[PDB]
Amino acid sequence: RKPPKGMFLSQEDVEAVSANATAATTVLRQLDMELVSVKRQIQNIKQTNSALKEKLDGGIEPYRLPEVIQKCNARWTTEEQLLAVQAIRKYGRDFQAISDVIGNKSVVQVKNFFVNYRRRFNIDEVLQEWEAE
């Protein structure tokens, strides 16, 4: 039913090597060139990536900031409320972002506030104007 293992012998293959007197030497020389083709296209992007690799020397270590380890709180001071409105104007509904901006409020109250002061802070306007961008 089947060839010895590792021997590769498909009907398709055998035909393409018998088609003429040099069909064998032809198909074997096409893969030699298909392979040199890849070999130097590997080493091309191996160079391009080396270059790109160098521009990231140092990583982003100069550019980091320490962590605000800040115990979360419950009451909304006017400063925190004012920060919120502005975050909403610049973050839409991405509550996570807002929580990081205000810092001492978790997303549930961030996602809360939205309905408690919705009429008072004119949030529909704010979100409305944040939708035009």
Binding site: P4, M7, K46, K55, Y63
Partner: protein
């Protein structure tokens, strides 16, 4: 196998079933109730057994029936029928036996046998055994034909056949009991040695040998599964199919590499597309950091838009900073698949120049086995005779295989130095015209009832004819003669006064320089008690070395042997002999092979006898007069001595059945 059932095996016969042969002589039995068939087979096996257990004395029908017991010895005519059928077709009382009942003084019928090669002598003994008048005509000054033994002093070396391939069902096995042949087992270990002079390492010897055998299997797959058996109208040879298999392996070796490195590009480019994200992200991070720094420089106390700006830029910077972190887990998730792939590359080559050269030695070995370039063997059929392989180890005849023909020729009428030049067969009989090989004007006329031709196939192939047929052989026979294959291999016999090789090894190889010279002296044999080494010339080398001075050839052997054993250890040879079998005009080759476009069916044509046309037109269809025996005539055992013998036994039975009647068919 053992018992009466081993006798059937040892006679190349199914023990539990009746052969086409037997159905022909016993159509009653084989068409009758299965019980009788079982009775019949037991008497066949039991009779064969009796002969085999003592093949130095004739097995007479009475001696036979005495030993048979009831209920098998109830029907005396079935026993007589069986024993007669066996005796006739040489399954029993063949070879050299002591005759319990001496031959009738009055002979009946005259048979001329062309050639005293083994097939010749085997029929001759059998026909004489059956009360016929036989004369063998022989061109040479010695019997045995292609069984040719060198003798000088204590030196003995077969130039012809030299191996018995296993006594498991071999008729030679009976012969060896009858004739004293010193049968010496051949130890199969064979170390190859490259052209430099140094052993191939076991690691290499085995990985190449297994590739060879895998490659053979592959051709059988192309043959039988893909039916790759014709190519631009010509039939496919084994050699072609091996190239196509080696190529398709080489092609797939490159194929994997291309698939492999095209994985390295698929990843260098995910990397590349990722570095670009990482650079462009470091630049967004560089700008935001500047921006946040500038906003943290506005000293407090500030208004809330300005405090928003700090807090915002800070969240925004941290967002981008966590993105660049997740992207250096991914840069360090592709920078190591890449390293993994680089260390795990597929195989560099299919075979190296040094691989392909040891592979060529394994091909030389096939070219030896079939005495021909693999470009000429039929892909489909070259191995058609491998089901009939004998069991057991292979042997050599330490005292020279000529001892057997010489044994057979005893008691026979043999005209040596008698070259047949023309065969005339007519409705009323035959005459054979032969000459004296010494002086070709002395001319001989031999009249007879039938001619048995054991002319080698190369002789029969010769243009223009060495032997003329009058009338010419019919086209169906001459076409088979063209179609078939008669190849060539030769031997160099090296006679020394020191043993300087490993005595515990019987044979050792030499690996050649090119594919073209693969068979040139690629193997040596230490078979003999005396210090004789024997060198083979196979494949395309065979025919080309024949046009080369004997001394040059001996020189190359010495060189090869110097390289192995050191220039000091290898003396000058005392006696040297080179065969040139294609050159010999009484052979024109060594043995036959299944040429491409030939099949084992040609071997059957070769044996079918010839029946002349009627002398007087409208007279009844005459008897066949021309019969053919010899190696090229026995489908299931060609190109051997046992096969020659068997064809000789075969023709003696049908000639008798023709000219003495087969009383065992009623």
């Amino acid at each position: 196998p053992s018992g009466v059932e081993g006798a059937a095996f040892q006679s190349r016969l199914p023990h539990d079933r009746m052969t086409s042969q037997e159905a022909a002589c016993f159509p009653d039995i084989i068409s009758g109730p299965q019980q009788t068939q079982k009775v019949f087979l037991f008497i066949r096996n039991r009779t064969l057994q009796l002969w085999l257990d003592n093949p130095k004395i004739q097995l007479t029908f009475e001696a036979t029936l005495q030993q048979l017991e009831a209920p098998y010895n109830s029907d005396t005519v079935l026993v007589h029928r069986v024993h007669s059928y066996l005796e006739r077709h040489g399954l029993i009382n063949f070879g050299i036996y002591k005759r319990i009942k001496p031959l009738p003084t009055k002979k009946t019928g005259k048979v001329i046998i062309i050639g005293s090669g083994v097939s010749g002598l085997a029929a001759a003994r059998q026909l004489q055994s059956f009360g016929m008048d036989v004369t063998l005509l022989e061109a040479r000054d010695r019997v045995g034909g292609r069984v040719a033994t060198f003798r000088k002093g204590n030196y003995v070396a077969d130039l012809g056949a030299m191996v018995v391939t296993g006594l498991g069902g071999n008729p030679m096995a009976v012969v060896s009991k009858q004739v004293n042949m010193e049968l010496a087992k051949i130890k199969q270990k064979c170390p190859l040695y490259e052209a430099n002079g140094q052993a191939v390492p076991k690691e290499k010897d085995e990985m190449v040998e297994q590739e060879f055998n895998r490659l053979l299997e592959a051709t059988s797959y192309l043959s039988h599964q893909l039916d790759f058996n014709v190519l631009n109208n010509k039939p496919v040879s084994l050699g072609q199919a091996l190239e196509v298999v080696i190529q398709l392996q080489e092609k797939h070796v490159k194929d994997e590499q291309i698939e492999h490195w095209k994985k390295i590009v698929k990843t260098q480019e995910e990397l590349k597309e990722l570095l670009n994200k990482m650079v462009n992200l470091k630049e967004k991070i560089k700008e935001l950091h500047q921006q946040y720094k500038e906003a943290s420089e506005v000293k407090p106390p500030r208004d809330i838009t300005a405090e928003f700006l700090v807090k915002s830029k800070h969240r925004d910077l941290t967002a981008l900073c966590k993105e660049y972190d997740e992207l250096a887990e991914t840069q360090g998730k592709l920078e190591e698949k890449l390293q993994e792939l680089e260390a795990n590359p597929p195989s560099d080559v299919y075979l190296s120049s040094r691989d392909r050269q040891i592979l060529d030695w394994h091909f030389a070995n096939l070219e030896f086995a079939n005495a021909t370039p693999l470009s000429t063997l039929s892909l489909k059929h070259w191995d058609q005779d491998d089901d009939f392989e004998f069991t057991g180890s292979h042997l050599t005849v330490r005292n020279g295989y000529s001892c057997v023909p010489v044994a057979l020729a005893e008691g026979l009428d043999i005209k040596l130095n008698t070259a047949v030049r023309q065969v005339r067969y007519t409705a009323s009989g035959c005459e054979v015209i032969a000459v004296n090989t010494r002086s070709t004007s002395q001319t001989f006329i031999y009249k007879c009832d039938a001619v048995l031709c054991t002319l080698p196939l190369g002789v029969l192939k010769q243009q223009p004819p060495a032997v003329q047929f009058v009338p010419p052989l019919p086209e169906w026979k001459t076409s088979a003669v063209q179609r078939m294959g008669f190849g060539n291999l030769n031997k160099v016999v090296l006679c020394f006064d020191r043993v300087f090789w490993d005595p515990s090894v019987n044979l050792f190889g030499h690996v050649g320089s090119t594919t073209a010279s693969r068979g040139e002296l690629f193997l040596f044999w230490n078979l003999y008690k005396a210090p004789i080494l024997l060198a083979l010339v196979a494949g395309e080398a065979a025919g080309i070395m024949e046009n080369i001075s004997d001394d040059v050839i001996v020189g190359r052997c010495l060189a090869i042997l110097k390289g192995i054993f050191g220039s000091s250890a290898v003396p000058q040879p005392k006696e040297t002999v080179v065969s040139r079998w294609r050159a010999d005009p009484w052979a024109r080759g060594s043995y036959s092979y299944v040429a491409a476009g030939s099949s084992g069916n040609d071997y059957d044509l070769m044996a079918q006898p010839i029946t002349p046309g009627p002398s007087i037109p409208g007279a009844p269809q005459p008897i066949p007069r021309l019969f053919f025996a010899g190696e090229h005539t026995i489908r299931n055992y060609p190109a051997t001595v046992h096969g020659a013998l068997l064809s000789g036994l075969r023709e003696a039975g049908r000639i008798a059945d023709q000219f003495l009647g087969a009383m065992y068919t009623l």
